[PDB]
Amino acid sequence: NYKKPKLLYCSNGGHFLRINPNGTVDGTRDRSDQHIQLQLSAESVGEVYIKSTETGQYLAMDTDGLLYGSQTPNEECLFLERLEENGYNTYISKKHAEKNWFVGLKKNGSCKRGPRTHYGQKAILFLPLPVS
């Protein structure tokens, strides 16, 4: 199911995860935005890389839990993808997995930093959707 690109929709504020050309990561309510098309791929079961098709940058999480775009797919870019019972997917930073730092978007579209994320919050629930 990683064969084609997709959008990652956050049910908290209704934002599509966006990797901007300048390297910042946020969300947008505009489904037509060119920077929300993402290619997910898995080298190992349950572990994914999430890449911007438009800029080639990989989603990554820094040491303070902020999401950013990385030119290279390194250890900071691996996420543990889990399918929750409510049917939503969650993504935990593999590097920061002991701390349960999730990929998350606030209601205003800004990244909810890893340490502020917690299981049970709407900010961490994502729905993979077809591009068009």
Find all residues with CB under 8 Å of 44, minimum gap 6, and list them. none
Tally of domains in the chain: 1
Residues belonging to the binding site are 12
Distance of CA 82 to the CA centre of its chain: 12
Residues belonging to the binding site for heparin are 12
Domain boundaries, position 97: 1-132
Q: How many residues does the chain have?
A: 132
Q: Resolution of this PDB entry, in A?
A: 1.5
CATH classification of the domain holding 9: 2.80.10.50
Give dist(CA 96, CA 102) in Å, integer. Answer: 9
